[PDB]
């Protein structure tokens, strides 16, 4: 195993280092506005060294954006695919690449058999080629790597099954900025090449000047280079035709033949395309070839890529003709005029890459190595696309919830083979495809029109319901004596209970467990733990009585705590935001202990008075002018007081101090240690009154944030033996700090209401001497070092915070982990900040055609970990990566993959068992079974189960290792006949494993294994 901490990789281009050196001046470069006037030596190409030009027809089909997926499919895409089939069938030399499999699959299953056969033939013969082959072309900023893998697998599995092809070249022309998580996943999924487009205009200029637009992209910690993936970065401002034939859009636009009036399109540079004829072909070719030779100067080989397409292009038959015929005339002339020394033709993406590598092998070029990312993107001037790191935060949080429910449903149901009547495969396929669809770069990014956001939400809601059905049927089967098990596959044996989604104050959706001497004395509940190690976590349920006690299935008492159910209300009468306690329902909380990838059953039983092993929290409402707060049968009376500073300590954990406004002010790690200043503050950013306006994509603040005026907010303090909390109703945010004995959990119920042109940010102020350095993660996979650059505007220093961020000095680190992707930064030494929501009245001119005014209440969750790190073995100052500590990593897992909770729905569970998986191996803490998926239906003689294993890398800080058993996923199910290492999509076998044992992987490595069972 490579050391990913101590050896700084030696690469030709390291993006953080390149950013430190670059000046980012936005000067007018001439016709290539963001470059310079390219010059070339006409003698470079000659009879023995020609410029091979591949023109690659393409059509960017967004799976939802300004129309929903189905609206686009009906109005545009089915026509594009139908006409592509006819035109490619009829014109053997014409070519076309396709990226979005969600649309292709939708189309293909509607085709008659004769057309399916015609389609397979034009793919088989190479005329229609799939690029990437994922369900979508995903966002690369907010997406979790697990979901990027899920959607890639969904599209490629469909392609393998129906088209018998697996793309090894990737095409990503529209994500807003690019992440190294893509080559990471692609290289481990058989890919050999990838192409990207949206990178900062300054970076395009800088790499173009050095001919570094093609590079071997390796991970920031990879010293050896085995993660490297050849990457082609396009050089210009857009993938449209005016910005793909060469440096001058005024000339390239003349070669987009769809821009001649009857189609309703024109060239904004005011020179229209002209039909090619024998009388103008020589002059037209001379212009085009000159553009091509200029573009060729920015690359190292004599093979040139010229994409030919735009959004939803190649729809009308007349469009196919006008593009094809004119280009065929140009190729015939150019290829027959020896003085150009060019051979041009339609081609596919793989053909381009194959020719580039043939040139490379001929010793024609050597390519530079590069590590780093390409955030944050600016397409021009100071227009940085950091707004979409936060836009539509309700759905960004929903993405993480569904991410987890999909993994839990696929894992719980993988243990058994299911009768087709159970519709398990059917519900999982729907859940994987709806979550996969949302990975689209207009989905999770929050950049679609209002009604399209609604469509994604409805689809994800359907997926959540599908997951719940599969999970509850699975739990019933796994914990019921086999000879008693009698499933009704349409019946709900259990109801899932989720405490944080949609969340308190968002939707009253949780069921109350109703107990009573005259109706039902007890109720079974079951917890599932998808992580491969034993885990304890507090869980809560709503119950109709405070007099409830908990036992495990051996009938051992379990210590519990009951607290009231508090809800916050904006009182339009008193004009205050204050809490009301339920007089009919209460929260019972207890520690559940669950086996690795297993289940544990408990019983809640009512009694007529205080049970021996249940305590009751005290509650203190701090506000001037209090009124009574009765709580029905709750045994402890609420207390009142004027606002004041408070301090709390649960268990032996940290002691937290709060200001009289209910916000954290300090954290004391141990009884001895100092009270470390850690202050939470909420602020707001506005929009500029002159110039460019912030919108769904762009963040264009009218200067640094201003503090939210807090007034004298109502603060609620609940203090219990297992859990305490401080909650405060601030304008637009009910802010809560919850303590359970370790790092606190923070929850924000964010309701930006009608605050137009406002972005609400949550900031942490400390005295940590971080200077201009901070760390943020990429796709929940790795942490990358960021350096705040004052030479760039505020919005350029915002980065994606998909799951965590931290700052540190030689002795102290503060890490903030998130349960949803949001945008954030560290704008001053000692600070961390992350945006909660943004409501923008104006459109930001990137084609959406609207502002963001559809905000709704969302419950954001976090864990806040203050730690001493002076004893940790950290990367040197020159290393571009950062790594979490064990505590921070576990805190992240508590947010993203919490225990799942199930309430038995009927009165009695006959044949109930107390546990499942007690014999599963409890793996080392840095290892995860990211995916467990049965890959065969029940009729298959040989059953196959796929596993994706990921090992992160945690800092060595002096805590002795200890125990843990080796995890061999191939022996998790019995009767194993074979074990194979496969690509991450499970589509190709890479290794036949000895003894049928799946070895664990190295730090920062991810592998996939498939076990076969007789
Ligand atoms: O913006 S508009 O001019 O409509 O169209 C452009 C040129 O065809 C496209 O690049 C728009 S891209 C397509 C869409 O997924 C992105 O959210 C847009 C971000 O700008
Ligand atoms: C699928 O493609 C392979 C080569 O890529 C070919 O040999 C095979 O016949 C095709 N169909 C099958 C047998 O699955
Ligand atoms: Zn797009």
- Same domain flag for 654 and 512: no
Range of the domain at 664: 618-897
Of the bound ligands, which one is closest to the alpha carbon of residue 124? 2
What's the rounded Cα separation, in Å, for the pair 301 and 232?
Answer: 12
Our answer on whether the CB atom of 65 is closer than 6 Å to any ligand 1 atom is: yes
CATH of the domain at 389: 1.20.1270.50
- Same domain flag for 891 and 960: no
Respond yes or no on whether the N-terminal peptide bond of residue 414 is cis (omega within 30° of 0).
no
Q: How far is CA 508 from CA 281, 503, 565, 848, in A?
A: 69, 8, 11, 33
Our answer on whether the CB atom of 310 is closer than 6 Å to any ligand 1 atom is: yes
What's the rounded Cα separation, in Å, for the pair 398 and 245?
Answer: 41
920 assigned to a ligand binding site: no
- How far does residue 694's CA lie from ligand 1's centre (Å)? 17
Q: How far is CA 516 from CA 57, 78, 396, 539, 556, in A?
A: 69, 58, 40, 22, 22
CATH of the domain at 497: 2.60.40.1180
- How far does residue 157's CA lie from ligand 3's centre (Å)? 23
Our answer on whether the CB atom of 256 is closer than 6 Å to any ligand 1 atom is: no
Residue with CA nearest ligand 1 atom 4: 847
- Same domain flag for 141 and 277: yes
* Chain Cα centroid distance, residue 1: 27
Given the DSSP bridges, would you call strands 758-766 and 773-778 parallel, antiparallel or unpaired?
Answer: unpaired
Our answer on whether the CB atom of 847 is closer than 6 Å to any ligand 1 atom is: yes
CATH of the domain at 139: 3.20.110.10
Query: Could you say which DSSP state residue 77 is in?
Result: I
- Same domain flag for 331 and 198: yes
Of 848, 777, 837, 756, the residue nearest 395 (C-alpha): 837
**Which two tokens mark 576?**
């205050």
Of 352, 87, 111, 55, the residue nearest 214 (C-alpha): 352
Our answer on whether the CB atom of 447 is closer than 6 Å to any ligand 1 atom is: yes
What's the rounded Cα separation, in Å, for the pair 526 and 904?
Answer: 8
Residue with CA nearest ligand 1 atom 3: 847
**What number does the ligand 1 atom closest to the CA of 60 have?**
13
**Which two tokens mark 471?**
């999970």
**Which two tokens mark 61?**
């089909």
What's the rounded Cα separation, in Å, for the pair 752 and 788?
Answer: 28
In SS3 terms, 4-21 reads as: CCCCCCCCCEEHHHHHHH
**What number does the ligand 1 atom closest to the CA of 441 have?**
15
What's the rounded Cα separation, in Å, for the pair 436 and 133?
Answer: 13
- How far does residue 299's CA lie from ligand 1's centre (Å)? 26
b/e string for 136-151 if b means 16 or more Cβ within 10 A? Answer: bbbbbbbbbbbbbbbb
174 assigned to a ligand binding site: yes
Three-state SS at 336: helix
**Which two tokens mark 245?**
């034939």
Residues 6+ apart with CB under 8 A from 832: 763, 764, 774, 805, 806, 807, 814, 816, 824, 826
- How far does residue 222's CA lie from ligand 1's centre (Å)? 35
Residues 6+ apart with CB under 8 A from 9: 218, 220, 221, 222, 223, 225, 371
Given the DSSP bridges, would you call strands 51-60 and 303-311 parallel, antiparallel or unpaired?
Answer: parallel
**What is the set of active-site residues?**
174
CATH of the domain at 991: 2.60.40.1360
CA angle, 843 as apex, 837 and 845 as ends, to 5°? 125
- Same domain flag for 938 and 912: no
Our answer on whether the CB atom of 217 is closer than 6 Å to any ligand 1 atom is: no
CATH of the domain at 757: 2.70.98.30
Our answer on whether the CB atom of 174 is closer than 6 Å to any ligand 1 atom is: yes
In this structure, the dihedral spanned by the alpha carbons of residues 83, 89, 92 and 97, taken in order and rounded to 10 degrees, is 50
What's the rounded Cα separation, in Å, for the pair 951 and 411?
Answer: 18
What's the rounded Cα separation, in Å, for the pair 183 and 217?
Answer: 7
Are the C-beta atoms of 922 and 946 separated by less than 8 Å? Answer: no
- How far does residue 171's CA lie from ligand 2's centre (Å)? 24
Q: What are the backbone dihedrals phi and psi of residue 542, each rounded to the nearest 5 degrees, phi first?
A: -85, 135
Burial of 508 (0-12, 13-18, 19+ CB in 10 A): exposed
Looking at the DSSP assignment, which residues form a beta bridge with residue 523? 604
Residues 6+ apart with CB under 8 A from 446: 388, 390, 391, 392, 393, 395, 396, 453, 696, 852
Residue with CA nearest ligand 1 atom 17: 442
Number of domains, the chain: 5
- Same domain flag for 734 and 801: yes
Q: Which of 472, 492, 512 is the last residue of a domain?
A: 492
- Same domain flag for 451 and 548: no
What's the rounded Cα separation, in Å, for the pair 680 and 658?
Answer: 9
Sign for the CA dihedral angle at 880, 885, 887, 890 comes to positive
Are the C-beta atoms of 592 and 600 separated by less than 8 Å? Answer: yes
**DSSP E strands: which ranges in 136-254?**
169-172, 193-196, 214-217, 229-233
Element (H, E) at 989: strand 989-992
837 assigned to a ligand binding site: no
Three-state SS at 350: helix
Looking at the DSSP assignment, which residues form a beta bridge with residue 620? 639, 717
Of 400, 432, 442, the residue nearest 154 (C-alpha): 432
- Same domain flag for 851 and 926: no
Q: Which of 451, 468, 492 is the last residue of a domain?
A: 492
- Same domain flag for 542 and 478: no
- Same domain flag for 854 and 908: no
Q: 10 Å Cβ neighbour count for 534? A: 17
What's the rounded Cα separation, in Å, for the pair 519 and 515?
Answer: 7
Of 935, 911, 689, 686, the residue nearest 794 (C-alpha): 686
What's the rounded Cα separation, in Å, for the pair 157 and 756?
Answer: 45
Q: Which of 884, 919, 954 is the last residue of a domain?
A: 919
**Which two tokens mark 763?**
């900031």
Q: Which residue bears the tokens 């707001």? A: 684
What's the rounded Cα separation, in Å, for the pair 469 and 492?
Answer: 7
What's the rounded Cα separation, in Å, for the pair 430 and 458?
Answer: 13
Our answer on whether the CB atom of 311 is closer than 6 Å to any ligand 1 atom is: yes
**Which two tokens mark 617?**
């929290």
Ligand 1 pocket test: which of 174, 264, 315 has the largest number of ligand atoms within 8 Å of its C-beta?
174
**Which two tokens mark 997?**
């044992």
Are the C-beta atoms of 948 and 149 separated by less than 8 Å? Answer: yes
Q: 10 Å Cβ neighbour count for 959? A: 12
**Which two tokens mark 238?**
């857009």
**What number does the ligand 1 atom closest to the CA of 176 have?**
19
Three-state SS at 451: helix
Q: How far is CA 314 from CA 91, 267, 308, 474, in A?
A: 14, 18, 10, 46
Contacts 24+ apart (CB under 8 A), 653-658: 653/739, 653/740, 653/741, 653/742, 654/739, 654/742, 654/743, 654/744, 654/866, 656/726, 656/737, 656/739, 656/744, 658/715, 658/726, 658/737
Element (H, E) at 568: strand 560-571
Are the C-beta atoms of 53 and 344 separated by less than 8 Å? Answer: yes
What's the rounded Cα separation, in Å, for the pair 142 and 728?
Answer: 29
Given the DSSP bridges, would you call strands 745-750 and 758-766 parallel, antiparallel or unpaired?
Answer: unpaired
In this structure, the dihedral spanned by the alpha carbons of residues 106, 108, 111 and 115, taken in order and rounded to 10 degrees, is 160
- How far does residue 991's CA lie from ligand 1's centre (Å)? 43
- Same domain flag for 468 and 446: yes
Q: 10 Å Cβ neighbour count for 360? A: 17
Given the DSSP bridges, would you call strands 618-622 and 576-594 parallel, antiparallel or unpaired?
Answer: unpaired
In this structure, the dihedral spanned by the alpha carbons of residues 576, 578, 584 and 587, taken in order and rounded to 10 degrees, is 160
**What number does the ligand 1 atom closest to the CA of 847 have?**
1
Phi-psi region of 86 (alpha: psi -120 to 50; beta: other; left: phi over 0): alpha
Which resolution, in Å, applies to this structure? 1.9
Residue with CA nearest ligand 1 atom 1: 847
**Which two tokens mark 677?**
């200043």
Q: Where are the alpha helices (DSSP H) in 369-449?
A: 393-414, 424-438
Ligand 1 pocket test: which of 242, 379, 846, 849 has the largest number of ligand atoms within 8 Å of its C-beta?
846
Our answer on whether the CB atom of 176 is closer than 6 Å to any ligand 1 atom is: no
Q: Where are the alpha helices (DSSP H) in 176-280?
A: 181-187, 201-209, 249-252
Give the orientation angle of helix 113-124 with respect to helix 145-163, to 10 degrees: 110
Are the C-beta atoms of 619 and 638 separated by less than 8 Å? Answer: yes
Q: Where are the alpha helices (DSSP H) in 771-927?
A: 886-896
Of 22, 19, 876, 693, the residue nearest 371 (C-alpha): 19
What's the rounded Cα separation, in Å, for the pair 1010 and 931?
Answer: 11
Looking at the DSSP assignment, which residues form a beta bridge with residue 605? 522, 549
60 assigned to a ligand binding site: yes
Query: Could you say which DSSP state residue 340 is in?
Result: G
**Which two tokens mark 528?**
């599932």
Looking at the DSSP assignment, which residues form a beta bridge with residue 814? 807, 866
Q: What are the backbone dihedrals phi and psi of residue 706, each rounded to the nearest 5 degrees, phi first?
A: -110, 140
What's the rounded Cα separation, in Å, for the pair 315 and 309?
Answer: 11
What's the rounded Cα separation, in Å, for the pair 137 and 160?
Answer: 18
- Same domain flag for 79 and 214: yes
Three-state SS at 55: strand
Are the C-beta atoms of 760 and 836 separated by less than 8 Å? Answer: yes
**What number does the ligand 1 atom closest to the CA of 62 have?**
15
Looking at the DSSP assignment, which residues form a beta bridge with residue 763? 681, 833
């Amino acid at each position: 195993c490579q050391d990913v901490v101590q050896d700084v990789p030696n690469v030709d281009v390291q993006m953080l280092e390149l950013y430190d050196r670059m000046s980012f001046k936005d000067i007018d470069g001439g016709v290539w506005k963001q470059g310079w006037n390219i010059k070339y030596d006409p003698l470079k190409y000659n009879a023995h060294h020609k410029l091979k030009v591949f023109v690659v027809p393409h059509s960017h089909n967004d799976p939802g954006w300004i129309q929903t997926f189905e609206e686009y499919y009906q109005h545009d895409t089915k026509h594009i695919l139908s006409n592509a089939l006819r035109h490619l069938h009829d014109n053997p030399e014409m070519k076309f690449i396709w990226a979005e499999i969600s649309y292709f699959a939708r189309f293909y299953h509607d085709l008659g058999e004769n057309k399916k056969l015609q389609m397979k033939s034009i793919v088989k013969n190479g005329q229609l080629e799939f690029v990437t082959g994922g369900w979508v072309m995903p966002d690369e900023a907010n997406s979790h790597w697990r979901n990027v893998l899920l959607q890639l697998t969904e599209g490629q599995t469909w392609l393998k099954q129906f088209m018998n092809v697996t793309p090894t070249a990737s095409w990503a022309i529209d994500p807003f900025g690019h992440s190294p998580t893509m080559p990471y996943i692609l290289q481990k999924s058989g890919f050999k090449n990838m192409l990207i487009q949206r990178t900062h205009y300054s970076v395009k200029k800088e790499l173009a000047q050095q001919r570094q637009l093609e590079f071997l992209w390796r991970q920031i910690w990879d010293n050896k280079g085995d993660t490297a993936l050849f990457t082609h970065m396009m050089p210009f401002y857009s993938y449209d035709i005016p910005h793909t034939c060469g440096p001058d859009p005024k000339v390239c636009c003349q070669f987009d033949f769809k821009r001649m009036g009857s189609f309703g399109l024109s060239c904004p540079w005011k020179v229209p395309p002209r039909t090619i004829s024998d009388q103008n072909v020589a002059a037209r070719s001379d212009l085009l070839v000159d553009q091509w030779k200029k573009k060729a100067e920015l690359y190292r080989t004599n093979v040139l890529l010229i994409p030919l397409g735009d959004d939803f292009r190649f729809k009308q038959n007349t469009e196919w003709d006008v593009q094809r015929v004119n280009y065929e005339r140009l190729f015939e002339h150019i290829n027959s005029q020896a003085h150009f020394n060019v051979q041009a033709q339609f081609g596919t993406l793989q053909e381009y890459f194959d020719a580039v590598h043939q040139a490379e092998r001929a010793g024609q070029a050597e390519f530079p190595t590069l590590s780093g990312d390409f955030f944050t993107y600016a397409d021009r001037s100071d227009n940085y696309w950091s707004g979409y790191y936060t836009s539509r935060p309700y759905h960004k949080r929903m993405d993480r919830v569904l991410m987890h429910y999909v993994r839990a449903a696929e894992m719980l149901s993988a243990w058994h083979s299911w009768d087709g009547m159970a519709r398990i495969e059917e519900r999982l396929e729907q859940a994987r495809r709806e979550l996969s669809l949302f990975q689209h770069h207009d989905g999770i990014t929050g950049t679609a029109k209002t009604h399209v956001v609604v469509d994604y939400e409805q689809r994800m809601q359907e997926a959540l319901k599908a997951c719940q059905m599969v999970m509850q049927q699975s739990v019933y089967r796994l914990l019921t004596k086999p000879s008693i098990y009698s499933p009704d596959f349409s019946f709900s044996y259990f109801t899932l209970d989720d405490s944080r989604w949609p969340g308190s104050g968002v939707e009253d959706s949780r069921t109350t467990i109703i107990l009573g001497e005259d109706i039902l004395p007890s109720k079974h509940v079951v917890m599932h733990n998808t992580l491969p190690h034993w885990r304890e976590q507090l869980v809560d349920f709503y119950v109709s009585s405070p007099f409830v006690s908990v036992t495990d299935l051996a009938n051992n008492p379990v210590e519990a705590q009951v607290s009231p159910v508090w809800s916050w209300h904006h009182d339009t009468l008193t004009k205050t935001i204050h809490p009301q306690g339920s007089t009919t329902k209460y929260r019972i909380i207890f520690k559940a202990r669950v086996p690795p990838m297993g289940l544990a059953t408990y019983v809640l039983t009512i009694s007529d008075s205080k049970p021996e092993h249940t305590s009751y929290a005290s509650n203190l409402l701090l506000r001037k002018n209090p009124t009574s707060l009765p709580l029905g049968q709750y045994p402890e009376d609420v207390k009142f007081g004027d606002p004041r500073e408070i301090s709390l300590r649960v268990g032996n954990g940290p002691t937290l101090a709060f200001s009289e406004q209910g916000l954290l002010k300090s954290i004391q790690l141990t009884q001895d240690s100092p009270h470390v200043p850690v202050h939470f503050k909420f602020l707001k950013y506005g929009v500029r009154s002159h110039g460019d306006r912030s919108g769904a994509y762009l963040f264009l603040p009218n200067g640094p944030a201003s503090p939210v005026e807090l007034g004298q907010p109502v603060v609620l303090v609940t203090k219990g033996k297992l859990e305490s909390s401080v909650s405060v109703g601030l304008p637009s945010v009910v802010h809560q700090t919850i303590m359970r004995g370790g790092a606190p959990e923070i929850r924000n119920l964010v309701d930006i209401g009608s605050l137009d042109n406002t972005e609400i940010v949550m900031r942490l102020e400390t005295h940590i001497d971080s200077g201009d350095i901070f760390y943020t993660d990429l796709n929940g996979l790795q942490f990358i070092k960021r350096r705040r650059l004052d030479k760039l505007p505020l919005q350029a220093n915002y980065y994606p915070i998909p799951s965590g961020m931290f700052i540190e000095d030689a002795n102290t680190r503060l890490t903030l982990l998130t349960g949803q992707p949001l945008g954030g930064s560290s704008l001053a030494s000692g600070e961390l900040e992350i945006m909660q929501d943004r409501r923008l009245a104006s459109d930001d001119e990137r084609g959406l055609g609207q502002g963001v005014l559809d905000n709704k209440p969302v419950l954001h969750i976090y864990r806040l970990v203050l730690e001493k790190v002076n004893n940790c073995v950290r990367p040197s100052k020159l290393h571009p990566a950062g790594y979490l500590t064990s505590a921070a990593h576990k805190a992240s897992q508590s947010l993203l993959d919490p225990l799942d909770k199930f309430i038995f729905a009927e009165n009695e569970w006959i044949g109930a068992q107390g546990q499942f998986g007690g014999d599963h191996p409890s793996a080392r803490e840095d290892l995860d079974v990211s995916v467990m998926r049965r890959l065969t239906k029940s009729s298959a003689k040989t059953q196959r189960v796929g596993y994706v294993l990921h090992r992160t890398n945690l800092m060595q800080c002096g805590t002795p290792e200890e125990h843990t058993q080796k995890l061999d996923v191939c022996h998790l199910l019995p009767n194993v006949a074979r074990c194979e290492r496969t690509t991450l999509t499970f589509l190709q076998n890479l290794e036949h494993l000895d003894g049928m044992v799946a070895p664990e992987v190295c730090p920062m490595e991810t592998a996939a294994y498939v076990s076969s069972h007789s």
